[PDB]
Design a protein around this ligand. Structure first.
Ligand SMILES: [Cl-]
Ligand SMILES: [Cl-]
Length: 116
């Protein structure tokens, strides 16, 4: 497995707007999960959303969405109604579920949410 890529490296939006990063990941045949994390400011990496949508736990209402685009390689990681407090760093992490369980992370990207 190759690590995903996460773009753009810097996204600047105005408070109230949506913000969308693109995670690109080219899978093996094998099952995988793609997690979107907020990395700072941090307690630890905080998982925001995942692909596939998690069915191991009850659903959770969220401003954060991960969608697979019809090309299958690209995924949108979106925030709705971005707040100043959403400013920080983010990454996407691919988890291979077979044959060996491993996680490979993208480089970080920064979200800057500016005052209206
Ligand atoms: Cl990257
Ligand atoms: Cl899904």
């Amino acid at each position: 497995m190759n690590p995903p890529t996460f773009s753009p490296a810097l996204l600047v939006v105005t408070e109230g707007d949506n913000a969308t990063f693109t995670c690109s990941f080219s899978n093996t045949s094998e099952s995988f999960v793609l997690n979107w994390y907020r990395m700072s400011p941090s307690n630890q990496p905080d998982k925001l959303a995942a692909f596939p949508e998690d069915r191991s736990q009850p659903g959770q209402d969220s401003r954060f969405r991960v969608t697979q685009l019809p090309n299958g390689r690209d995924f949108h990681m979106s925030v709705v109604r971005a707040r100043r407090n959403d400013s920080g760093t983010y990454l996407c992490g691919a988890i291979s579920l077979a044959p060996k369980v491993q996680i490979k992370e993208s480089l970080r990207a920064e979200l800057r949410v500016t005052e209206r």
